[PDB]
Amino acid sequence: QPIKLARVTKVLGRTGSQGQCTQVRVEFMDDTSRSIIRNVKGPVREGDVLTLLESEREARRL
Amino acid sequence: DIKLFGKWSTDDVQINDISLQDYIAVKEKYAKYLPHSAGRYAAKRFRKAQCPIVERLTNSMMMHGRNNGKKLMTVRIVKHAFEIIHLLTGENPLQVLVNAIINSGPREDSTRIGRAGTVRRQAVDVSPLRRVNQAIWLLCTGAREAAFRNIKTIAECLADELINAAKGSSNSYAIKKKDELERVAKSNR
Amino acid sequence: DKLNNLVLFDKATYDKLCKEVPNYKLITPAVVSERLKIRGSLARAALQELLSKGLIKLVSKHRAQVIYTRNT
Amino acid sequence: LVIPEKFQHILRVLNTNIDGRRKIAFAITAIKGVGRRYAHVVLRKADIDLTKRAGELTEDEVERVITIMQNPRQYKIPDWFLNRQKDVKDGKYSQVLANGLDNKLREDLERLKKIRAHRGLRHFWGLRVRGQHTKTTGRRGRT
Amino acid sequence: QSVQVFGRKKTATAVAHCKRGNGLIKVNGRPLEMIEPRTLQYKLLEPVLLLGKERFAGVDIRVRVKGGGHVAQIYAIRQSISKALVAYYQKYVDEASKKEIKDILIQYDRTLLVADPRRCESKKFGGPGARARYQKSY
Amino acid sequence: LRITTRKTPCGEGSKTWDRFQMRIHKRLIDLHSPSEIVKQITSISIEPGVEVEVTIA
Amino acid sequence: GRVRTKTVKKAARVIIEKYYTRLGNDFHTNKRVCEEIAIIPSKKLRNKIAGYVTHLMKRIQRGPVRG
RNA sequence: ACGAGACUCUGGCAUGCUAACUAGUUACGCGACCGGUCGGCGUAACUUCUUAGAGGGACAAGUGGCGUUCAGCCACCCGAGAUUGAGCAAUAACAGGUCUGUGAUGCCCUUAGAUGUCCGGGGCUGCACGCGCGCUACACUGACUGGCUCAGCGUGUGCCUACCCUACGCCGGCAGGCGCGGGUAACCCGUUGAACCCCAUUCGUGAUGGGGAUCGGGGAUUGCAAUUAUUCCCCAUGAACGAGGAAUUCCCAGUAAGUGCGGGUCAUAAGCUUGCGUUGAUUAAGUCCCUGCCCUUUGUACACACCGCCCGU
Structure with a gap:
């Protein structure tokens, strides 16, 4: 269960059946070269940092 | 000096989450002698994080249609158990508070995701703000049920739950809720 | 339901109570009631009596939060 | 006056048995009419300290209480x-x-x-x- | 002298008469250390010890209060004290330290100088409260 | 003056009310003069709806 | 919602069409000149037309305005 | 062009301005401390402190990131204020309720045998139960001896209208008798001393003090007529409720929520409603699910418009 860093750089949009989540683009600080997409739950500010169990997760994509 | 209640030092806190001090702050200049400043942060967005978290506590163990409108009681009851954690662990209550907020704070949750289906759930990342909100909610729910109908008074049930959630002990109701959230995140990928 | 508690004066309020409350570091009517099997009401009464005897240090007083600490 | 050992479960009404666990100003609520503020006021003007408990319930206390509940005019009670x-x-x-x-x-x-x-x-x-x-x-x- | 410029919160207000006196702050015949709730005294000593207890060097400040609610009076009594200090420190003495203490208490909070314009809204009929409405009957 | 009146003559429909408010504005003019001079000033075709109460003491 | 309606936009359009030189550079000058030469019943409306006059004149410095 | 917007009262800065003797803090003693402190207030008295006037002020005006670079959206400094709340609200229509609102009204019983009408002595004042707005709670964030003390809209002596608020002496726990007076009114209660809270009292997990929810007597004020002590209280009565299934109201800032006062009905009357204060959040600044609203495209044999039309035995 490795844990690395991820910080928001682009709020792609809101997803969920009733606006549950935010599909947001996050960069890994330890690599500063990768951008991944996450359906982060909760109010998200552009530039916040969160410790995550996952480093490769993707959700429904459009 | 800006010590809490004039007796708990504020120049000793260490969040140790690399970059999270903007979403959990007790050192910030908004941190005042008392956790009472009346409600002004709830109006706008991302201003709730500018709240001194002592205020968020004294308003989160402030609920259930029997307490609303009794905020001075909440400030007295936080002075209580602040001076009690001052002696139970022999350390500043702010340190155990930040430990509780850094461990109880959830990361993975499970939510319904999709535009056309309703069968299962999907794992989601809970943002720092929502994680502190629901962690303080679990803490307050336990502290209410731990002294509900019980001989144990306030400031000790809350105290016990806080101490056994701050060290990462799974015996806490809040930490077992955190474990339940993590396991339901495991079981709904 | 059924009210039935200790109301008898015997070797429970002086012995094992005056010999186990001073040696502990946190002293509360709830704490004394729980850790020493004693009634919280009589715990408050005896704590008031021994405070009148003068063997504790008081921080603050409340209906549910009377703050005591060891002094002697 | 004060005595550590006087705790008894039963008070005498008609040789029946009652409860004796309640504290003073509340142990004489077992009588149908006595209790509430009536027992409170009789203990209040009884010229005794009310900090006593069930275990310190003396027989002189009970005798005086029974006499005062027999007729109300002990303290001119209507x-x-x-x-x-x-x-x-x-x-x-x-x-x-x-x-x-x-x-x-x-x-x-x-x-x-x-x-x-x-x-x-x-x-x-x-x-x-x-x-x-x-x-x-x-x-x-x-x- | 009356250099009072309100100092308000909700419908309760305070007027901070200031003069060259003893350095003791009075609130309608009672010291600020003793107020009826017995809980907001720190909220009252916050401004003075935040800017410095040494500032008062012979200034007599009597605040007269009137309005509804005790806590509503507070956040305005202290606002009135801060206003009186501002007026005294603007009338004659310099501004560099005035701006220093102003920046310090402004970063401390905002309810020491500028009043909260909030107020209790009216209640709308067809419900128990202004925004809450009765339960729907099925 | 507030008068909140139900609108529907017979109780039916949503609970709807009118709120008729009556604003009554009152000034006083106390002048150091015999009332005859003030009455001489009075005959100026006073505005309708403005009522005058005379106080002499 | 801060969308300015056709009343504000069209009155400002007519004003800048008509009194283009009479305008000022500051909003507070703009409201005064607008109140000088327009029957605007209320302060709020004349403020709104003045503000859109300022924004339109800001748009003038870089190009033409369609209306 | 109507509607929306705009409008108007405003909530919110008038330190600037007309200006109080029904408003109010500070130039000398009134009962106290070698200079401080009173709502019986000190001679002297200025609009700052409450009302109510004119003008001003806030405009996405300023900066930054997005945007078909536009309309606009999101962040930021100043600023009282960067979405204060409501009444007005279209074209056109309903077979939705009201003929029990009306001295506005259509053949039938009503043609004086007049569903109250002069007088007036019962009636929507019934018991087995189904989630109709709501009520006090299940408790120790607390009912509870009482300490200290902070309210805002208002309502108020009067045409077949006693009865309205209501400053003291005597008595009377409970309501109330006579008087000197205070009130058409910011003059009188009033400084709504109030009321929620400010936690020094038995309280400890219960049938006692959470839970007057279930007994019989008595003083009695408006009421000829309290019979279901209907409504003004004193003693005793602790049933049920351990925060409660499925379906499921309502809520974004001085809001929800807790809290008491006022207006309506009114012998003096509120578990209801309408206003007011007081205390006062994590609730998310999103989506359309399963809720309605029918906007665009589409089909139609419907147009009385799907509660349509229609086929056959």
């Missing part, structure tokens, strides 16, 4: 402060202890039906005395 002022069907002024004598007065269902009174018929069926209007609403009694 009869209406008791549950029974001038009695019905007799010209007394006091409440009677035990059962079979006071409860005989309460049965008030036949004679008012003789004069076809509403109160007696209402108490005959066990209906409401406060006058709770009954149309359909109510969730007690049969379910």
Whole structure:
């Protein structure tokens, strides 16, 4: 269960059946070269940092 | 000096989450002698994080249609158990508070995701703000049920739950809720 | 339901109570009631009596939060 | 006066048994009329310290309390402060202890039906005395 | 002298008469250390010890209060004290330290100088409260 | 002056009310003069709806 | 919602069409000149037309305005 | 062009301005401390402190990131204020309720045998139960001896209208008797001393003090007429409720929520409603699910418009 860093750089949009989540683009600080997409739950500010169990997760994509 | 209640030092806190001090702050200049400043942060967005978290506590163990409108009681009851954690662990209550907020704070949750289906759930990342909100909610729910109908008074049930959630002990109701959230995140990928 | 508690004066309020409350570091009517099997009401009464005897240090007083600490 | 060992479970009314766990100003609520503020005021003016508990309940205390509850004029207490002022069907002024004598007065269902009174018929069926209007609403009694 | 410029919160207000006196702050015949709730005294000593207890060097400040609610009076009594200090420190003495203490208490909070314009809204009929409405009957 | 009146003559529909408010504005003019001079000033075709109460003491 | 309606936009359009030189550079000058030469019943409306006059004149410095 | 917007009262800065003797803090003693402190207030008295006037002020005006670079959206400094809340609200229509709102009204019973009408003595004042707005709670964030003390809209002596608020002496726990007076009114209660809270009292997990929810007597004020002590209280009565299934109201800032006072009805009357204060959040600044609203495209044999039309035995 490795844990690395991820910080928001682009709020792609809101997803969920009733606006549950935010599909947001996050960069890994330890690599500063990768951008991944996450359906982060909760109010998200552009530039916040969160410790995550996952480093490769993707959700429904459009 | 800006010590809490004039007796708990504020120049000793260490969040140790690399970059999270903007979403959990007790050192910030908004941190005042008392956790009472009346409600002004709830109006706008991302201003709730500018709240001194002592205020968020004294308003989160402030609920259930029997307490609303009794905020001075909440400030007295936080002075209580602040001076009690001052002696139970022999350390500043702010340190155990930040430990509780850094461990109880959830990361993975499970939510319904999709535009056309309703069968299962999907794992989601809970943002720092929502994680502190629901962690303080679990803490307050336990502290209410731990002294509900019980001989144990306030400031000790809350105290016990806080101490056994701050060290990462799974015996806490809040930490077992955190474990339940993590396991339901495991079981709904 | 059924009210039935200790109301008898015997070797429970002086012995094992005056010999186990001073040696502990946190002293509360709830704490004394729980850790020493004693009634919280009589715990408050005896704590008031021994405070009148003068063997504790008081921080603050409340209906549910009377703050005591060891002094002697 | 003060004594650590006087705790007994039973007080004497008609040789029946009662509870003796309640504290002072609350252990004499076992009497039908004594209790509430009546017991509070008799203990208040009894010229004794009220910090005593069930275990320090002396026999002199009980004897004085029984005497004071026999007649109210110990401290010039009027009869209406008791549950029974001038009695019905007799010209007394006091409440009677035990059962079979006071409860005989309460049965008030036949004679008012003789004069076809509403109160007696209402108490005959066990209906409401406060006058709770009954149309359909109510969730007690049969379910 | 009356250099009072309100100092308000909700419908309760305070007027901070200031003069060259003893350095003791009075609230309608009672010291600020003793107020009826017995809980907001720190909220009252916050401004003075935040800017410095040494500032008062012979200034007599009497605040007269009137309005509804005790806590509503507070956040305005202290606002009135801060206003009186501002007026005294603007009338004659310099501004550099005035701006220093102003920046310090402004970063401390905002309810020491500028009043909260909030107020209790009216209640709308067809409901128990202004925004809450009755339960729907099925 | 507030008068909140139900609008529907017979109770039906949503609970709707009118709120008729009556604003009554009152000034006083106390002048050091015999009332005859003030009455001489009075005959100026006073505005309708403005009522005058005379106080002499 | 801070969308300015056709009343504000069209009145400002007519004003800048008509009194283009009479305008000022500051909003507070703009409201005064607008109140000088327009029957604007209320302060709020004349403020709104003045503000859109300022924004339109800001748009003028870089190019033409369609209306 | 109507509607929306705009409008108007405003909530919110008038330190600037007309200006109080029904408003109010500070130039000398009134009962106290070698200079401080009173709503019986000190001689002297200025609009700052409450009302109510004119003008001003806030405009996405300023900066930054997005945007078909536009309309606009999101962040930021100043600023009282960067969405204060409501009444007005279209074209056109309903077979939705009201003929029991009306001295506005259509053949039938009503043609004086007049569903109250002069007088007036019962009636929507019934008991077995189904989630109709709501009520006090299940408790120790607390009912509870009482300490200290902070309210805002208002309502108020009067045409077949006694009865309205209501400053003291005597008595009377409970309501109330006579008087000197205070009130058409910011002059009188009033400084709504109030009321929620400010936690020094038995309280400890219960049938006692959470839970007057279930007994019989008595003083009595407006009420000829309190019979279901209807409504003004004193004693005793602790049933049920351990925060409660499925379906499921309502809520974004001085809001929800807790809290008491006022207006309506009114013998003096509120578990209801309408206003007011007081205390006062994590609730998310999103989506359309399963809720309605029918906007665009589409089909139609419907147009009385799907409660349509229609086929056959």
